[PDB]
Amino acid sequence: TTLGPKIFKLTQNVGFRSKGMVQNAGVVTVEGSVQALITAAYQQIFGRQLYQGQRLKVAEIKLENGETTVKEFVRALGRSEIFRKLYWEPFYVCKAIEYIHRRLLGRPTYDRVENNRYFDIASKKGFYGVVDAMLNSNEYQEVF
Amino acid sequence: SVLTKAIVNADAEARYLSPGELDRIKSFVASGERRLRIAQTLTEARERIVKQAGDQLFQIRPDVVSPGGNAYGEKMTALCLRDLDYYLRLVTYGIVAGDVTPIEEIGIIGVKEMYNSLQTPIPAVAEGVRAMKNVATSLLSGDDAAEAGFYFDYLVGAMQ
Amino acid sequence: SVLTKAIVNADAEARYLSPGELDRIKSFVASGERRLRIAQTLTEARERIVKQAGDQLFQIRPDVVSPGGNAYGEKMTALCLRDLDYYLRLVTYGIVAGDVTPIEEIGIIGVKEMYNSLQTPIPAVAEGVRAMKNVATSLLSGDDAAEAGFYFDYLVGAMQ
Amino acid sequence: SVLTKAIVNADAEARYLSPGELDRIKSFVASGERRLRIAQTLTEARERIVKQAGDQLFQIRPDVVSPGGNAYGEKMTALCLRDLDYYLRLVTYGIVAGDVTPIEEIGIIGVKEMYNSLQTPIPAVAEGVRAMKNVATSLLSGDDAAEAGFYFDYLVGAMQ
Amino acid sequence: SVLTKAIVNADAEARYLSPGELDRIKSFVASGERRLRIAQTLTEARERIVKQAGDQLFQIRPDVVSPGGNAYGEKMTALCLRDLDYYLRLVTYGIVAGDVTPIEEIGIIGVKEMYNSLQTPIPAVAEGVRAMKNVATSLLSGDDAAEAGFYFDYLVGAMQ
Amino acid sequence: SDEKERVVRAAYRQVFERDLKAYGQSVSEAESKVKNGEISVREFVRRLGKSELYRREFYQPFINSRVLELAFKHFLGRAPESRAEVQKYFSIISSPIVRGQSSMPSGGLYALIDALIDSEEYTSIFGEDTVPYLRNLGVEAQPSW
């Protein structure tokens, strides 16, 4: 509805579709709807855009070329370098987890059962381990 | 265009065009002949405008055309005016389309990376465009000069 | 440092440190005494390095100290050498730690955005740094000059 | 001086000086050593005042040192600062005289015509004198800087 | 201020301001421009005031500036005048606030303990302040000189 | 004559949580009378409570509800123990009374301090001559709630 925030879904082919248009056509309208999806990924995962060195290209290049989905572009961003750094590293371990959950699955944790699942996965596997559960849950897939 | 933009939003939400979207197509198409006249006048004076804008760019930025300047020399200056000719052309396209789709894919997306490589000072390209606005705008009626001016200020905006 | 970098990678994996992140630390400790000495040597000649860097820079790029240049004028030049003094300082920090670490947070992350705002030509800042390499390197033994040179070329690299 | 201005009134009415006229000569002469100190300080820093005035001027209005500018070039610039050196000198004269008689006959009566002929912006030029006041006002302790400042503001006043 | 003092007493007794408290705020604020002028004059002559207090001090106590004196030497004297500059500043603050709250937290509460540690003779600091009163007071009208004088005598009082 | 000063600096530490002597402040006028016997340690502590120095330090930077909690730790040496106890004290600091003599009557701060000091409990444990001390773990039976 209009009572909540917009949801961006990349339906626009992308895929580097091609056509029956001039071979080196200058304008290709929808090759710019992907681009707004790309910036909107950043705006959920980190909350703002990154600075120049920081952006992760070569993840975008592939999304834009149609080789990987939206789902996997989020995974690359989630398991990235600055994401770790900004949000994992400087905080107490469970503060890191609670905050990371809001960014990757849009809501706060409900429980201690849930919180603990990750707290005891982070102690064996690290940042990487924790990220990969939020990303691999059943709930991620049903919802997103 | 206005058409492309309206439709893409329609198709992406799986729906027919809105009353609003239909209205803007109607207002847009009514301005067709006028927009075509604005492009003609500017196409007809393209030399005058590009040269003049170069004299004024090189007055506010005398060093671009100086020892350590990107446009220093006769053929580094020739390419610079050619780029000014490119952008005036794209501005005529934008005016007849009623939005930037074409202007954008052809000459702003990727422009930072292109000019950074060539080491061209971007903000002085933005000045060259303001200079063209000033010249072009002096060859158009008040109403048409404003309508043209929006597209000049867009390019100035995108190089930023 | 080398320590910080090794540890952060260790903790991320949540396992005590490993063989090859210990050997590097040992190398760094021996290196650190030499590294500390190089930084002290660089610190001693700072005013000479900056000033001679500044002459080498303005010959190679006179356009920045010209009418439409970012560093045109006596102050605008004073602030420019002060920035060159800043980066030499960060280079001494980088050498001593054995890892670049702190310099990045202090003076490259955000540097594009800072200088774009001020309209400073980034690639001529990179030249000012090469100029400092040349001077600093002439006050160090061959082996120490190379070790220092890596950190100068890093900054030159990051402004890119 | 105060003497020249005042005695003239005496002679023109065919009479000796009034108690009033005598009093002002006395108060004036008592304020002598201070005025001489104000002139000394400024004479002592003349080269600094002129150049820093010259930088302050060209930032606030550079175009004069550009292709179509009156002060464009090394020897067209050697003359603009020389004129700034002239006016600082006249300001020291005025301060020790306690009025403008000397300043006026030497460098304002006939000027405006003079500057106009040469086509120099007169307001460009008053910035430059106003800029010289700043550099100079800063090589003097707070009491002497004010006393000097009156004479700078006079020249700024006359040139317009 | 007068405001802070009035309010703190109000809040501590859980009540709105008294007619008295309201009256003093009104009389105080009416003297605003005058109090601001008193601070300006003294701010404008700060360097002079510090030097004349310092001369008056060393005549009266040549010993402080003697072999076994706290202020013996060129840089033990430099810090001493700097402390005199500190207290004049606080006196300007007090005058514009209309009470001592600021003067007190910044430079009297703890001052015995500070100076006892440094082994500075407190009563000769009180003399340095009297010396500043004498100089500052000679640059103010009778009425303003008294109003200023209360704050000088307070500091003299608190170092006791 | 030194026993007195052992005692008078104990009060500064009990009421203000540390001696004010090092910085250099003191409640001077009041202080002399305790040494010379006109007013008891009870009157001395009450004068320190309504003084300009304690208001600035423990009343100004906090809220009325936080002022009640710190007053119990200074004039009774223990934490508030019940919610019923908050409403007695919170509504004592909260109302104006009026001004009666020189003034500062039922104050906000002033009323709260008399109320503590004149309480039954206060003048029992420390009644009259002793400066208040923390009744923490070794000393009394501590509540666990």
Added chain:
Amino acid sequence: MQDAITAVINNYDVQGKYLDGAALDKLKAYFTTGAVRVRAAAVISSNATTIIKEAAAKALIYSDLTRPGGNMYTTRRYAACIRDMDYFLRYATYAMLAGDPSILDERVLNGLKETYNSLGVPIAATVGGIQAMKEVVGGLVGPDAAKEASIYFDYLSSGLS
């Protein structure tokens, strides 16, 4: 706490600066509005009780709040609530005289949000009680003082939400 004037003094003290032109201009901007602040305080103080009664009448009572199950049910809690109201009014009058909101933070807002969460005190309802007193105040004090009184009521209410 701090007021307009001590806000400036402490901002310069930490830099060890004598007051300069910019500082002196700020202090003037306070002194020049001072007489009006005083008059406004005398209106609020002397109408205190009527402001609370009209503010409660527009924003609190004749409602579920005053009925069984409501937080201002019982004479005890009704008394506590209008007691609070008097605090707000009184302190806002201090803030407006001082020309600085710092006292509203130090002696009113600090911990109050959680105190209200812990007792169950309805926050949104309390804000309406604040913004109703502002409405009444702005009528009583007139053109001279309306905007200046108003801001410290608005400071209070965005401090809770």
Added chain:
Amino acid sequence: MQDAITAVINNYDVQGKYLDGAALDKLKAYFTTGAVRVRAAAVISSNATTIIKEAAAKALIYSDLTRPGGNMYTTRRYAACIRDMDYFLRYATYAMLAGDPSILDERVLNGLKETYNSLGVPIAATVGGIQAMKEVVGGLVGPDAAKEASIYFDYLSSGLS
């Protein structure tokens, strides 16, 4: 969020009222200024970067703020600060288009005062950065739009202080 028009619709909806003459007059007062709001937004957007640079130059840099010990020392923090500046400019442009400040509360001010207290970010210095951008904006947009743009910069700055 809400704009001029939805502010009126929701104010009437809670009373279940069809729009009446008073409502219709308010909406007209918005529509009649609408074209001018659009032109002003196009000036701000296209001069965004220059406004920040001139505002920083007058109110932030060449100072202790940018020196060691200062909050906008380090390229990291300098970048964060002018990033913030861009937010303010951009959102004020939204508020002015909408003719309603509600978006400045919902998406900018809420919690920001305490966020800045927690990081150490100097509030007074940030306000000057806001009021300098306003100064620049008011020159660029002209008589038509100056007062209308200005108010949402003033909304922002009294929201922090």
Added chain:
Amino acid sequence: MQDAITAVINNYDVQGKYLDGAALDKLKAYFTTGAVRVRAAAVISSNATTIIKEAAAKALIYSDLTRPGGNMYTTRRYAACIRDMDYFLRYATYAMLAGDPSILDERVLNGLKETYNSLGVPIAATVGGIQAMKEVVGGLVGPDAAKEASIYFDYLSSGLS
């Protein structure tokens, strides 16, 4: 986080000072103990599990703590407790390598006291578990490293109490 070396760099950076003699002496005092820190970490890491086992045996189990009603009753909670123990050991090993306790604050102590109060986790019993691991560690690492390892266990334990 920071280590010995970055502690010094950041302390000078805020003053914008090149490293001077006093700084250089501090860094030497770290480098000169560096090889010993590494050897000590390799002993702790490779005896990790045995240190926890011997520390639990001396300070936790065979007690009311492991019996019904005790906080380390249930395999779930016993597992959580020795999991915690491994954190402490591992991070103390980081702190000792870095020669700086800052990581123990940033990633271990912050909020932990209240977290334990909220779950009911016995603080005093946890401290004994820390000081027992220290005892074991100090035997295993030898004269060279005993005092240096020990301090970060002591940092941990006065961080909870």
Added chain:
Amino acid sequence: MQDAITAVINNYDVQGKYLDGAALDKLKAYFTTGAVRVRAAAVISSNATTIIKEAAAKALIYSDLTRPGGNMYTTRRYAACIRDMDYFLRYATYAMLAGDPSILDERVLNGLKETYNSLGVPIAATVGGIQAMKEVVGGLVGPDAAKEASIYFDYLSSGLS
């Protein structure tokens, strides 16, 4: 708190052991150094003020710390800082007499790191103030007592870092 004589008793009491040969040897190792501890305390106490003065002079004042913007700027804060210094000196003298650091934890270090973080008090600068007082102390007390006094100053300073 505990001291060497007391610690030996409580360390054995928890094991329910009579004092045995190992215990008796420890207590002897304390008693045999006792007279020297007393003499050292009398030197420190009677030179207290001079030690602080010389320690501040070498490690704190004549610096940015005492200048505007510095934490020991203002007579208030200068007084608080040398007040603190006296605590450290005095308690270290207690620890050294007791031959046990436990009092330095119970009554000085507990919460102090965070207290200093919360006020902004510079930790590294405070450590230098501790290690400068140690330097002075070690000269005044002589060969007999130098090492024994020194350790409790070192206990204090690694307790903050």
Added chain:
Amino acid sequence: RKVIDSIKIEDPVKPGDFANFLDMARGIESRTGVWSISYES
């Protein structure tokens, strides 16, 4: 360790560690600009 009358001392706030006017005196240098022009010529 000598005379009182070093009392000529400027009283401003001294520059911070990267002001634009620490490298000001080196900023006048070795180009062809307004600071290149020989004054006595």
